[PDB]
Structure formats: C-alpha cells, structure tokens
Amino acid sequence: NSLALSLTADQMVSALLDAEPPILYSEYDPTRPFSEASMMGLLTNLADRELVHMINWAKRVPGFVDLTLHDQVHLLECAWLEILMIGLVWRSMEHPGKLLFAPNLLLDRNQVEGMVEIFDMLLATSSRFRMMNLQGEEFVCLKSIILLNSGVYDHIHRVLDKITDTLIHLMAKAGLTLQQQHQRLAQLLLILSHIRHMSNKGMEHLYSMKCKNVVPLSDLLLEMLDAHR
C-alpha cells in the first residue's frame, strides 16, 4: 500500500509545493545570445543542472518512491523535457512574448534555425496559461501528472486519480462552479498533449545538436537523449 493514496487534497498540494525545485540562474555576462553555439550552450548547461534538482523533486512526488528503480528511470527518461518545458512556460507567464529560461536569461523569438517553431509553441503555451490565470498549486499538480503519465507504458493510475481529485479540490476552493470545474480540468489536461508535442519536437532538435557535435552535451543529457531513441 502506497502512502500517496492516503493523503488528503491539502496534504498532496503541500507535498508538491514543498518538493518544488529552485529556479536556477544561467551564466552571468549580459552578452545577448544571438548564435547557435552560445544560446544552445546556455540551454544545455541550464538543463544539465536542473536535471539534478528534477531527480530529487521526482522522488518527493507522492507515489513515485513506490515504483521500482527501473520504472523511475523510465518515467524520467520520457518526461524530463516536458517537465523542463512546463516549468519554462510557467516562469514565462508574466513575460508575454518572451521566454524566461532563467531570471538572467530572457529570450525573444528574434534569437537559431528551425528553433523558432518550438519557440512559438512555448510562447503560445505560456500565453494560454496566462489567460487561464493558472495558479501555482495547479501548476505543480500538472507537473506531477506529466511525470507519472508520460511513460505509464494500476498503482500509477490510482495516484493519477488522486491528483485529479486534488485539481478539482483547488478549483472548488477557488470558488468555481461545478461546470467551470470540469471545463477547466479539461482545458488544463488538453494542454498536456501540446507539451508532449513540443517535447518530441525539442528532442529531435536536441538530436540534431548531438550529430552536429558543436554544442557540448553532458553525458547525462546524452543518455537522456539516447533513451528516446
């Protein structure tokens, strides 16, 4: 029996909020990245450091610990980029038209070859979150859903249900009517399909970066990449 199922909605929310990884900084040096090497160098470096924090965060997500090591490896290999991306669009909500990879790394679309497509998708996602007035408590629920769901191919489904209960819990707490609750639930969950899409596209770009072999990639980032292939 997993402990996750015994948690109350508020306990779940508190567990997720307390597990939140910190917002990391990019390199100082106000040189605006306007090239392939520089920009991607900063993004991979950032992703590298965030991955370490993500791994400790995942272990604190209720139900994740109950899985075998191999299952935990699989989920993270499938969801890592989706998780970084949803975090990105979350941080970028209050910066319409821009992507806040880090507090000292704010990029606009005017900055790399085939990359603009993904950039625009991320911007549209952030804008969507902004107009929906996504709340922090809702964001953390969605992020855990991505972790548990994206690679889910009975325990996890049980856990996923509890997170759904938690999402509805938050909305009712926010004063939403019954119809507004299920509508907002559908809206939030449908966005996860687009985050999946962006992840797969970004992974293809990461692969090109590898085969072009100009931007330095950590062994960890490379193994995460290999897993998708």
Partner: peptide
Amino acid sequence: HKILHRLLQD
C-alpha cells in the same frame, strides 16, 4: 549503467 540509476539512489 546509466547515470540516472546512480542519481536516483543517492
């Protein structure tokens, strides 16, 4: 042997 294996243990 994946780095992820090691990191998930520590």
